[PDB]
Amino acid sequence: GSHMALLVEKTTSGREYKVKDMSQADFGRLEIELAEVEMPGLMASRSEFGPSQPFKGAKITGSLHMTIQTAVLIETLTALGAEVRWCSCNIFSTQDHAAAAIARDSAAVFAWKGETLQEYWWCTERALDWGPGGGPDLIVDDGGDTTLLIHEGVKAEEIYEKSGQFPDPDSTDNAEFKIVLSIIKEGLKTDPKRYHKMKDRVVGVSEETTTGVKRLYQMQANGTLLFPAINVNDSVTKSKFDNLYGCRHSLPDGLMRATDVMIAGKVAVVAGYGDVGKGCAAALKQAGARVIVTEIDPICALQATMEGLQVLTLEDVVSEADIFVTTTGNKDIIMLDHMKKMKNNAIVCNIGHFDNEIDMLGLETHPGVKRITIKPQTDRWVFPETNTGIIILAEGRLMNLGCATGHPSFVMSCSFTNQVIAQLELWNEKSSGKYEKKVYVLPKHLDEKVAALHLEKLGAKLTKLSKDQADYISVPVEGPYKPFHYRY
Amino acid sequence: SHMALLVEKTTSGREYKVKDMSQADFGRLEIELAEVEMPGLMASRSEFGPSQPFKGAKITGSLHMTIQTAVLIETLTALGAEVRWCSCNIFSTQDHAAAAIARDSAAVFAWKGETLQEYWWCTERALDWGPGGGPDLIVDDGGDTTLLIHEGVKAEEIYEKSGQFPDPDSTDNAEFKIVLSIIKEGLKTDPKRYHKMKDRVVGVSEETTTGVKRLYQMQANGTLLFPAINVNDSVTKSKFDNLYGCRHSLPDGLMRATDVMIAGKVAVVAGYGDVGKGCAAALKQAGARVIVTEIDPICALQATMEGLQVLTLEDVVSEADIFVTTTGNKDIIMLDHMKKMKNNAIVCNIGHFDNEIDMLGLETHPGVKRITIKPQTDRWVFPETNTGIIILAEGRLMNLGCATGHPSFVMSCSFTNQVIAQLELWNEKSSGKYEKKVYVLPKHLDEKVAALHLEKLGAKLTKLSKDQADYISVPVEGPYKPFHYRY
Amino acid sequence: SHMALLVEKTTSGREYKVKDMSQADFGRLEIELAEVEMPGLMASRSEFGPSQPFKGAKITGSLHMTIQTAVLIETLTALGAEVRWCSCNIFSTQDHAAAAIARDSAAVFAWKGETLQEYWWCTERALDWGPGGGPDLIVDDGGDTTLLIHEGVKAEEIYEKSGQFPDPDSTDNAEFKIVLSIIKEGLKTDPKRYHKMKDRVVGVSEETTTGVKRLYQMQANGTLLFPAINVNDSVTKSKFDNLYGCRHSLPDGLMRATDVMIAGKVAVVAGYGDVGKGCAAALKQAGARVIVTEIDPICALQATMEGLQVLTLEDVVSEADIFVTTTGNKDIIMLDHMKKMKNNAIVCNIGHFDNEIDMLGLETHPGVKRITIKPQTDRWVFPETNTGIIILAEGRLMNLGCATGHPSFVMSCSFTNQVIAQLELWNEKSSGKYEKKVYVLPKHLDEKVAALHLEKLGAKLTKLSKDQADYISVPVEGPYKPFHYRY
Amino acid sequence: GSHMALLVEKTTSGREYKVKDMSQADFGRLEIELAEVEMPGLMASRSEFGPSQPFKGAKITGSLHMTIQTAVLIETLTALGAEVRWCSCNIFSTQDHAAAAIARDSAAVFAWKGETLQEYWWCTERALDWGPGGGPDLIVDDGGDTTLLIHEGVKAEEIYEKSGQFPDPDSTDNAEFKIVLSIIKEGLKTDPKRYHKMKDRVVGVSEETTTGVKRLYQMQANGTLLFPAINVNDSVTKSKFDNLYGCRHSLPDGLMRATDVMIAGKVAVVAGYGDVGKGCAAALKQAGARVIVTEIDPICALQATMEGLQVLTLEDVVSEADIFVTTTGNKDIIMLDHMKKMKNNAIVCNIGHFDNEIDMLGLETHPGVKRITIKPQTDRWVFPETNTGIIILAEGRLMNLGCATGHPSFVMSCSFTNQVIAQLELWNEKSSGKYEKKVYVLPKHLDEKVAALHLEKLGAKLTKLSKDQADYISVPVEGPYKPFHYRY
Numbered sequence A, D: 001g002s003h004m005a006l007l008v009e010k011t012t013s014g015r016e017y018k019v020k021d022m023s024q025a026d027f028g029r030l031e032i033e034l035a036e037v038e039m040p041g042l043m044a045s046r047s048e049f050g051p052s053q054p055f056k057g058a059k060i061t062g063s064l065h066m067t068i069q070t071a072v073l074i075e076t077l078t079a080l081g082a083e084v085r086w087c088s089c090n091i092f093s094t095q096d097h098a099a100a101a102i103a104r105d106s107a108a109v110f111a112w113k114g115e116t117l118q119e120y121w122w123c124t125e126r127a128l129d130w131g132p133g134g135g136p137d138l139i140v141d142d143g144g145d146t147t148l149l150i151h152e153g154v155k156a157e158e159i160y161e162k163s164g165q166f167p168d169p170d171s172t173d174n175a176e177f178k179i180v181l182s183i184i185k186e187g188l189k190t191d192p193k194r195y196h197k198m199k200d201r202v203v204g205v206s207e208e209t210t211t212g213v214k215r216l217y218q219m220q221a222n223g224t225l226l227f228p229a230i231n232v233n234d235s236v237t238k239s240k241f242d243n244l245y246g247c248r249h250s251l252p253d254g255l256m257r258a259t260d261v262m263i264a265g266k267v268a269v270v271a272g273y274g275d276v277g278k279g280c281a282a283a284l285k286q287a288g289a290r291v292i293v294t295e296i297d298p299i300c301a302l303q304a305t306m307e308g309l310q311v312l313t314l315e316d317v318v319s320e321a322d323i324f325v326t327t328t329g330n331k332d333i334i335m336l337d338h339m340k341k342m343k344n345n346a347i348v349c350n351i352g353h354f355d356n357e358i359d360m361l362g363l364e365t366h367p368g369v370k371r372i373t374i375k376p377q378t379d380r381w382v383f384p385e386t387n388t389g390i391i392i393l394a395e396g397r398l399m400n401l402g403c404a405t406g407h408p409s410f411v412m413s414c415s416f417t418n419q420v421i422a423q424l425e426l427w428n429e430k431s432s433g434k435y436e437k438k439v440y441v442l443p444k445h446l447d448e449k450v451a452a453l454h455l456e457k458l459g460a461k462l463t464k465l466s467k468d469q470a471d472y473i474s475v476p477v478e479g480p481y482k483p484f485h486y487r488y
Numbered sequence B, C: 001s002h003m004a005l006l007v008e009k010t011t012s013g014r015e016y017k018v019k020d021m022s023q024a025d026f027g028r029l030e031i032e033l034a035e036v037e038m039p040g041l042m043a044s045r046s047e048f049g050p051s052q053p054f055k056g057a058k059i060t061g062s063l064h065m066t067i068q069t070a071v072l073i074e075t076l077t078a079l080g081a082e083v084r085w086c087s088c089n090i091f092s093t094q095d096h097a098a099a100a101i102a103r104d105s106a107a108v109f110a111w112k113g114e115t116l117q118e119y120w121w122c123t124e125r126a127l128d129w130g131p132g133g134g135p136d137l138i139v140d141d142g143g144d145t146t147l148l149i150h151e152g153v154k155a156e157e158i159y160e161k162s163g164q165f166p167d168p169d170s171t172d173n174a175e176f177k178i179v180l181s182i183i184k185e186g187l188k189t190d191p192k193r194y195h196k197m198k199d200r201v202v203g204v205s206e207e208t209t210t211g212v213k214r215l216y217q218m219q220a221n222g223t224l225l226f227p228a229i230n231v232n233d234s235v236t237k238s239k240f241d242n243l244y245g246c247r248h249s250l251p252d253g254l255m256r257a258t259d260v261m262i263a264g265k266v267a268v269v270a271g272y273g274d275v276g277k278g279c280a281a282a283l284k285q286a287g288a289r290v291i292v293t294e295i296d297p298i299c300a301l302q303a304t305m306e307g308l309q310v311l312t313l314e315d316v317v318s319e320a321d322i323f324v325t326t327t328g329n330k331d332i333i334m335l336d337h338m339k340k341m342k343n344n345a346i347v348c349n350i351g352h353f354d355n356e357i358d359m360l361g362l363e364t365h366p367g368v369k370r371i372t373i374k375p376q377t378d379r380w381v382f383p384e385t386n387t388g389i390i391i392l393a394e395g396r397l398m399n400l401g402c403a404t405g406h407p408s409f410v411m412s413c414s415f416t417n418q419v420i421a422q423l424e425l426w427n428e429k430s431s432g433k434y435e436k437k438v439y440v441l442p443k444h445l446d447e448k449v450a451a452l453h454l455e456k457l458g459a460k461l462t463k464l465s466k467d468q469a470d471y472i473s474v475p476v477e478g479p480y481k482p483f484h485y486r487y
Ligand SMILES: NC(=O)c1ccc[n+]([C@@H]2O[C@H](COP(=O)([O-])OP(=O)(O)OC[C@H]3O[C@@H](n4cnc5c(N)ncnc54)[C@H](O)[C@@H]3O)[C@@H](O)[C@H]2O)c1
Pocket: A209, A210, A211, A212, A242, A243, A246, A247, A271, A272, A273, A274, A275, A276, A277, A294, A295, A296, A297, A300, A327, A328, A329, A330, A333, A351, A352, A353, A354, A398, A399, A400, A401, A406, A407, B462, B464, B468, B472, B480
């Protein structure tokens, strides 16, 4: 094979991995130990469920961003008896010391910060490739790439089984999808029933993020979804916490690490005002920026105005603003056309799941443009027309994870305790038909439980309803406390 | 009270009972200002006026009888409705609004400072369409009009068979004794009043969380007599009026009633739902240190993320300067709590009903003394301590009781939803689309409400390309969010 | 006006003129509440009451005649002073406060809604200690009482020599014509009134930025007749009342006058000094998008750091919903600006004098029409456009004119400084310590004011060890900051 | 000499330096170029004054923290004709790439991140040691260490000149001062009139920070101050901007980089509520912490309460709080006694100038304590009594600079344009007696000018007074606009 072939390494115990630097394991462990204290829902899950080993025999593939927080999640799964293989769901989001500690101590991990796209897809394939004993039984996904690979893999395998044909990247004009089809092609040479076996064994997927869940609904709508899915993003204790308060923390962190720019006194544009945009706008306003929101949804627009934020189209503000943040989960928000109008050293970043919110393709092909790397994940692109630049963060990829460390532990404990519950539910319920090849959410009493598990850490003292009071508001003393449609 | 509970009539023969008709010109002046602040309602008049969709309809409403409600009423009449109205609280009426409506537009039975007897008499009047019958449609806020009809029908069933009347001795609740006595008296005049009424009612649209709770109870126990639209739980109602409206009107109520500085104080907000979020926001933004009480661990955790301490009432009762109940529950602030409060602690309620605070225990505490500072600000002094507390609006919703409730712009959001709900029920009167259950308006209409309010504020919306719309799986024209989206 | 400008007298012979003495009981009730909120004043009564330091003193004040000022007045009288008072603005009096004071404690000449003639007559009355002479001491807010004395002395000098009177034709300013006519009339009765007065005045303590500006002008031109203490520039005045007080009372004024939703609007704050900072804070915290105008690049830069846009008025005149002038300057919002404003834009002033907004240009605009919505809320409609603007309190300080001004707690800070200033001037009356110049209170007393207000709020101060105190070069007991510290 | 002797290196042009890694110069230049855009007051100073070379012939020693921002300041001094030698005023505050770029391109620099105290004082001595041509003429100081060394050097030289005696570290129990006296002792062997010559030549010092200015007043009060001083800290455009808004930026940056802890939901204690404490409290509250302030000054305490913050003594909250930040400029704020009461993983940091706000001496000698370094400048100290830890940032040294990058460029341009003005004034005015051996502040019209220079960058449009309006408020159309005693 190739001089530069990607090859798995093995620990002294024989577990596969590929990480940046295994010498970083001790440092990873140190920060993991700190995180544990900040993640009471995960630690409570270990205490409650560890002894009964509910995941005994289960094989779990995950793609949550390979951070210290994810490390605590992984080690909760393993504490509960799972065997685990992991990759990151973005080329820039891995924390190398986290990856090293997990590789050393707990799970197969294929992840490093600064992957090429070919490396990224290879790592995804590896995390899914359990070899002859088969697997996974369970998938934890963030953004849907792992789920996509499986669905596209089954499709390719069907064509191969019927007609002998391999995928051909020439068939697509999308550069990344060419890589995907190439991975699949090569994988047919090693195990051309890989994905069919998986299709038959996988109990379900638990999906972390808004973009991933949109993809799940597309597959359900078109009748292609192969196994049950739990939508973790839309737990209240996920969407209304991680997406909002997480970003309120990690947006400014990414800006400050990447650029050190003063936010106070600047004009910042936030495209989108969903959960992520709300948290980003909040951080920016809190820091002393004057925040302008773009929106397509009149309800979200009206919310922004109630918070004292101006709502305009991008075109209205492109020449004036200092910082741009895309939060939409859509595509084509900041185009080359917009970039050409920006002031010198305008900062352009994306915090939505995929980089196509920003027109990186257009930028890279703009005649005469010059990319000057300031430092990793801070790039100044100089427009020749003006001899002025724009500062792109993380090549348009999720800026919080790419330029900083993403969300903090405490809020990730809320998201990831939902993940643990979701995994437990899929595994425990596998032999009714509680779950069809459809998208489900966790029940409210479990959503409430996640919150309840995090109150003591913060010293929050909850009031107990009397029986009379609970009757009066039509709820049980132990909850759930809100109607099905409650929005919080 | 100097009020005689006999209807008056306009020159045209339309009934009313208000405090002072001389206030009508002033009412009109403030309505004229409110119209500019209520573009959703004005847009509704322009869109639907030519077709007069409420031609021939008879509508009873109970929305608080404010300037804002006047604009709603006059939207209904601009669209062809004949209207009778009452307030849903004894202290929430704005007398000038009532006067202008009574004079110009609709039958109104409402004044600020009703007794409970007067309150229930007004409710009966608003429902009394005379021999001809009615209402066709009900607009309710808190469910008292809906309650009266359901309890009336129940009493009429028993009466028809056994001749038994409701007996007020059956309840120790002073206000419910009044309701049972009103039902008894109505049996003695027309034992089928409410049976006939319920058979003619096309539906009710309900404004507020407490009222919608009641509706869901009636649906669950199979007693609900007619379709209901839950207006509260439109996004453009619950996450605007309940939240931002209270953020405005809570401090307004506090300032008018007491003039107390909020900055530097400790304020307790009991509950952290939509109302409690708005109330806590106002207090914190005014420089108070806010402590939240909650039963729901999700809401509690939200409060902590906003930098608020979450404790039980018992932990802070002697420390706090201001107490605000927002729960929609009962028995939040009891006499036992009151007795521990510092001198001149301010106690108020902004939930729908006054039983959040233990007025009964207060009023019956041996040796207690009430000194009225001014209307709706009372200082109660305890004999044990010789210190006092300040109760606002006798525990009734303080924002409406001590100030003017929410402002026009936010009420335009709420009330545009009410227009849409009323139009839906009425247009569908003969179609069988709605069963005797509780419905919410569809998302495209919730979005329309928002969209109607953007121009006023200069908010400029982006349009999706078809490619972008496809990418996120929505139509270019919406709706833009999944059914279970929480905003 | 129905007011007869003839003094009334109490049973005891003390003069007054108020709107309605029947309001005294209500005044008393609200004063009793205010006392609990004003610990600095109450502490002053406890500390100094036994020694009666103002025994035999005659004090004239012009503080706005509110409940808060009533507590100040009754601190002065608790300490032995005899007091005469007027308000320093035509719309700022609270009639119940005035009544209670008139009845119980001091001569008061004040009502809400004075004409300018009445305003100046009240000022003369507050200064009129009869043949015996007085005042010994003046409490001023904005400098009009001080002005009258200085202009009076000037006119008396000319009169004594040439018999010439002030001629109102010498000014085109309608209000200054009233002042010159009052001086003329007083020459015709007692040509040495103000000469005698100035020789007896121990000093003045001045409350507000505009008043202190005037004092510094008089010092600079050598006309200042007596010592003055600048109370405004105590830290515990300027950086509390002017800032936090307006943060409270600006939204109060807006809400009472108009009930408009602030959230979602664009609001312009002209000026970003202490008052503009507080006003902008309130508006932003209420959900308005605030645009600041400024002439001072430091203040402008501060605003930007707070996330506010800084533009000129001309850039935003047609966009903003609410305009608030805070400058202490003149000619901020002119007729030319008004004409460009959207229908029902709200225009108000919270600086000391109404000439921040061009009332004269408005009132004299051909074909303009004023429609009073209610007292202190006027809608002016222009003939060119047939659209209107809403002027609050005819351009007079809106917080006091449309609401109740600042709350008691913050006014206790301001007014404890006034007590200290008055005690200093009076105790030093015969010592020659103060020249005919403007003085500020020393830092240890500024700190004492703060310290007197901490217990109320439960704020617990740390004590320096002697080693720590030495390390930062301060005494354990303070003062804790260098002379030029800005806080 | 010693195997591990600290020795100056020289550039290819012969200029002295000692930095961590000269290969970092290119990276420093890249970030310097970005900073320049964010520092319009400094760049305007270059444009206005560059051609006239006002500092021709002047030698300037500085000790401003050796950051990218300071690099822009240094290169403004050199653009204006100065020769410059520099050190950092804290062992952890240097940005190594900034130091390298300056060393390479513009000035002698003795600075690295992670200096020992002996290295720190050596670098201070080197920055002051111009060799046989003499110098400096001018000093820019932050915290007063450079000024202290000169004053203590003159004292030692007087004793040496009169009585032949050298300093003896045994004479002091203060470990750091032993190092100082040792430096001075050794320096007497190379030039025993170094400091006397300086005393005679130095035109003045411009002092950056509150602690430094307190020291200057002590020397003025005791009649020991040797040369004029300009107090830059107390320009309005310094104290009310850098100390406040700078810390509002850089406090949370330091916490997030050092620990990644979620601030939202926590209890944070801010000791002191001066300018720095106001900005720190603001950041913490803005981020969703519940902030408790400690104060000795009743005015500052009352301010805090008006902002909705609880004011308590440290003892009231030590067992409950999650984060502690000292802001006092005092000493002995957080003692070992307090530390022993803190919860597991409480974060303890200092943002005041000197580390003695926190009882590091007491901590280090606590029986059985164990220091576990998580990563540089994040240390977990484990108390044996409880088997719980506290997290100390930057060994108690200024946490914003030690754990992150300190303040951002834009606000430092305000501080440092004051520095430029101060230096120009001292140099230009040296031959009257405008300036005695006393502490002075810059006049208000120059303070205003600093602000005015930063408005256009932010798009802020200032109104011009009419002549009539300016008369009415008793100010000139061109300012100054406020009375001498105005507090802003
Ligand atoms: N980086 C992180 O740590 C992180 C955390 C959570 C979620 N995510 C991702 O962030 C993205 C947003 O998630 P969310 O939960 O806020 O979704 P959301 O659906 O709640 O909000 C997205 C918003 O974008 C608006 N929008 C869509 N197209 C737009 C356009 N062309 N211009 C302006 N506004 C437009 C929508 O109206 C909507 O309100 C998703 O990709 C999600 O997966 C990232």
